[PDB]
């Protein structure tokens, strides 16, 4: 009953900071090309609008359950990564679990985008799945480079091995995995260079081309959690937060600073770079970040 309230604390904090992180993305992309743009508390009002309609669509019996499964999977992703010391479980937060549970949101946001039935949703799913094909070639090598440099997989036995000694973006056989993660994060998010699972403008909107009221609200929740989960997975592995309430709140605050830190370098790349053809997106994630992560993988062994 206490782990239930603690998990409710983590999911409601991840909501009320992940939406603010997406609003920070909107604010920085507004200032990146000379505009005030929205207030900081903007996508909260997006979600609050999208649950206030009076009609919906519901094309099929599976059209509901796919995106609801996407929200359940993206909540399951953030439940294992150690959000500060307050973790509902730290015994098993293994690398392969969190790495695969980022991809399952890219199922359910697309598995229920297929049930509508559209050439726009079909070619959006066509251009979304080649990413998830191509991005796992430098992603797996980054995970092996994290693996063989430490040995342990329980993610509480990694932040302990960071706060004992050293940082983790240092020690160059592990830094070459971080550049591979810094490039794969824009694809795993849906930011502008490797945008194409969102693609606003070239195709209509790809997978989320016609969802409706409540379904777009669940998508905004899922997209904010995908943001927060992949950013917390990058920070609790390659950066390490680790660490009384005046110690715990400051621990979560410096964790939030390192959340913004990779999120800050995810935006500066992700506005000055145009959208990528999916035929080149399959060709790019095998040339440069694969050989970088492969040099990191043979230098971690």
């Amino acid at each position: 009953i206490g782990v239930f309230l603690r998990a409710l604390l983590i999911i409601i904090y991840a909501t009320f900071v992940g939406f603010i992180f997406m609003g920070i993305i909107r604010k920085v992309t507004a200032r990146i090309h000379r505009r005030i743009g929205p207030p900081i508390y903007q996508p909260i009002i997006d979600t609050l609008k999208f649950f206030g309609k009076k009609e919906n669509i519901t094309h099929g019996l599976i059209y509901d359950f796919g995106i609801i499964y996407a929200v359940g999977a993206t909540i399951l992703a953030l439940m294992f990564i150690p959000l500060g010391p307050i973790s509902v479980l730290r015994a098993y937060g293994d690398l392969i679990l969190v790495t695969f549970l980022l991809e399952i949101p890219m199922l359910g946001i697309m598995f229920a985008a297929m049930s509508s039935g559209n050439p726009y949703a079909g070619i959006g799913a066509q251009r979304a799945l080649l990413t998830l094909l191509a991005i796992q070639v430098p992603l797996g090598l980054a995970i092996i480079a994290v693996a063989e440099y430490y040995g342990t997989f329980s993610t509480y036995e990694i932040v302990m091995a960071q706060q004992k000694m050293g940082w983790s973006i240092f020690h160059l056989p592990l830094l070459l995995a971080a550049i591979a993660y810094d490039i794969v994060l824009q694809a795993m998010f849906g930011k502008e260079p490797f945008d194409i699972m969102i693609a606003p403008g070239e195709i209509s909107l790809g997978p989320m081309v016609e969802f409706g009221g409540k379904h777009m609200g669940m998508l905004q929740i899922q997209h904010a959690m995908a943001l927060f989960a992949e950013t917390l997975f990058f920070s609790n592995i390659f950066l390490g937060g680790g660490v009384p309430l005046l110690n715990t709140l400051a621990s979560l605050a410096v964790l939030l600073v390192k959340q913004i830190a990779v999120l800050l370098i995810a935006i500066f790349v992700g506005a000055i770079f145009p959208r990528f053809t999916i035929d080149q997106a399959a060709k790019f994630y095998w040339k440069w970040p694969t050989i970088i992560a492969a040099i990191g993988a043979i230098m971690a062994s």
Partner: protein
């Protein structure tokens, strides 16, 4: 029962934000195109049987809306054509004013084409900057003549409102020197990155024999090997005393037809800087006092006239015929994009991927109010 079972027909209709207002039905084959016919005419106001009912002077304001991005090139061609059938004596001051507004609307249309390209090429920063720097040109036009766009300015003889003076002519020097220092920050976002160069490379290969006989008249056949600039070949306004240099490439893929428009922006801004240091001498803004009054009853002697003028997308002509009364018997406004993104687009999308259907659509500067007329 779905009777194709092989080729799915997605089609970019009006509400798509890549194409502006003309639907291209694409017989897609997985991720390529095997047949790309277009259905234009979502905007057919009509101007043949609609501009035949207004008098000769008031048929300016109705004729502006044939091309939206350039709100001066459609009036400045009809004002050049009714100049010919009556045979005025348009002075040096009106010629200079019409020259400078014909070149500043052209740099506005280039800036709008950059913003329209960047809104569909993903990168928004080159879109927001291009619209921001188009807005100060709009706010500079507003001092002169009237509204932002559709400034009904160039009546068939001369203009309607002269310059305000040193508050205005010094201001154009300021914004042109500013944007000439600014233009080196458009290259790094739109023309120097290895994304765009790797995105528009080799797509829509236009041949050399495929441009001159096809209907193409713009700056985009000039990226193919063709030496034809209507400002250079037959100068009309105060063009011969400018000495600008035109770009010609031997290429013909899509990014060849984009770098040529970037260089046209550079040399056209150099034109407006070169034209300003001349400065207009004295003179009237109107042409004549006696043969202009009773402004509806404006009997023009019969005959016909053709005029044609450079645009952002295509050297597009007008065709006025005068029966002899106060009615244009037929004013035809040839849209620049009639065979310039309708017919040449059909043999340009065959084989191209879906990601380069919108980029090819903007690499010809397709403006849907010109096909319909």
């Amino acid at each position: 029962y779905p009777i194709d079972k092989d080729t799915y027909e997605l089609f970019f209709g009006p509400q798509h934000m890549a194409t502006e207002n003309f639907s291209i039905i694409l017989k897609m084959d997985g991720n390529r195109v095997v047949k790309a016919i277009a259905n234009p005419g979502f905007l057919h106001r009509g101007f043949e049987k609609l501009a035949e009912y207004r008098p000769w002077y008031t048929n300016i304001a109705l004729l502006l809306r044939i091309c939206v991005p350039e709100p001066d090139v459609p009036e400045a061609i009809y004002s050049m054509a009714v100049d010919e059938i009556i045979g005025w004596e348009v002075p040096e001051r009106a010629q200079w004013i019409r020259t400078l507004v014909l070149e500043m609307a052209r740099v506005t249309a280039y800036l709008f084409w950059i913003m329209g390209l960047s809104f569909k090429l993903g990168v928004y920063t080159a879109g927001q900057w291009a619209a921001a720097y188009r807005e100060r040109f709009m706010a500079l036009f507003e001092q002169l003549t009237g509204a932002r766009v559709y400034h009904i300015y160039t009546i068939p003889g001369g203009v309607r409102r002269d310059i305000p003076g040193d508050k205005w002519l010094r201001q154009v020097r300021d914004t042109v020197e500013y944007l000439k220092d600014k233009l080196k920050d458009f290259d790094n976002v739109l023309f120097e990155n290895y994304i765009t160069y790797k995105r528009l490379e080799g797509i829509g290969v236009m041949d050399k024999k495929f441009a001159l006989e096809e209907g193409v008249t713009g700056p985009n056949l000039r990226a193919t090997g063709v030496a034809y600039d209507v400002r250079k070949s037959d100068p009309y306004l105060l063009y011969p005393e400018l000495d600008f240099e035109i770009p010609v490439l031997k290429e013909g893929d899509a990014l060849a037809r984009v770098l040529v428009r970037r260089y046209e922006l550079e040399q056209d801004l150099y034109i407006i800087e070169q034209l300003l240091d001349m400065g207009p001498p004295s003179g009237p803004y109107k042409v004549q006092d006696p043969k202009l009054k009773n402004l509806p009853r404006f009997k023009v002697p019969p005959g016909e006239a053709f005029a044609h003028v450079e645009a952002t997308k295509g050297d597009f002509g007008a065709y006025v015929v005068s029966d002899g009364g106060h009615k244009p018997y037929r004013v035809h406004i040839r849209g620049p994009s009639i065979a310039h993104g309708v017919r040449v687009l059909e043999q340009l999308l065959v084989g191209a991927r879906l990601a380069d259907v919108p980029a090819i659509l903007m690499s010809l500067d397709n403006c849907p109010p010109d096909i319909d007329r």
